[PDB]
């Protein structure tokens, strides 16, 4: 149906007006969105969620050129193209979207997040779920493969339980880097003493 467009990192009244004028609507959440519009690669919660879902991530020019044309244009020419950020992170946004379209990055993972992590637990939970993973709101107390805990040094006192039952402690970068690149490599993010 008509696009349900989410925005991140931008203030774009013109863009919103274009969405509206062309028969689309504003998405209330990543879960509800068909498209994400932004100006460059920005690791916001919305961006990571959209990427995890595989929805098109398009520049502001998509809407402006669509309004000029009088109809929503195909997304292809408007994919966000940010070579500086691609170089920095060692990834391709198009290739990561392709991976998200082929499979759910975190299916089969169960992930708990300790309270001091950034982004905070409920925001991590949104990202996790957008990648098809299972967010755990309660502390896990038994071992299962791919059941992991995202934590940080500040939260060491909160890791006694997962440490005992053998659940890996991972830095937030497991998700911040992994979801951006659409790779799940927990080994690389295990926290040392």
């Amino acid at each position: 149906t008509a696009p349900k467009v989410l925005f991140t990192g931008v203030v774009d009244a013109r863009g919103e007006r274009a969405v509206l004028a062309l028969g689309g609507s504003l998405a209330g959440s990543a879960a509800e969105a068909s498209h994400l519009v932004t100006d460059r690669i920005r690791r916001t919660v919305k961006f990571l969620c959209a990427l995890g879902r595989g929805i098109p991530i398009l520049s502001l020019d998509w809407l402006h050129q669509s309004r000029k044309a009088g109809f929503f244009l195909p997304p292809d020419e408007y994919v966000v193209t940010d070579p500086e950020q691609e170089k920095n992170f060692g990834f391709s946004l198009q290739d990561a979207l392709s991976r998200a379209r082929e499979r759910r990055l975190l299916e089969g993972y169960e992930i708990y997040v300790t309270p001091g992590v950034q982004p905070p637990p409920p925001q991590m939970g949104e990202i996790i779920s957008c990648c098809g993973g299972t967010y755990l709101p309660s502390m896990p107390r038994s071992y299962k493969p791919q059941r992991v805990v995202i934590t940080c040094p500040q939260d060491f006192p909160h890791c006694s339980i997962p440490l005992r039952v053998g659940l890996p402690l991972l830095s937030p970068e497991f998700l911040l880097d992994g979801v951006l690149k659409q790779e799940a490599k927990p080994e690389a993010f295990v926290l040392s003493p």
Partner: peptide, 4 residues
């Protein structure tokens, strides 16, 4: 919005 916040970036991370």
């Amino acid at each position: 919005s916040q970036e991370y």
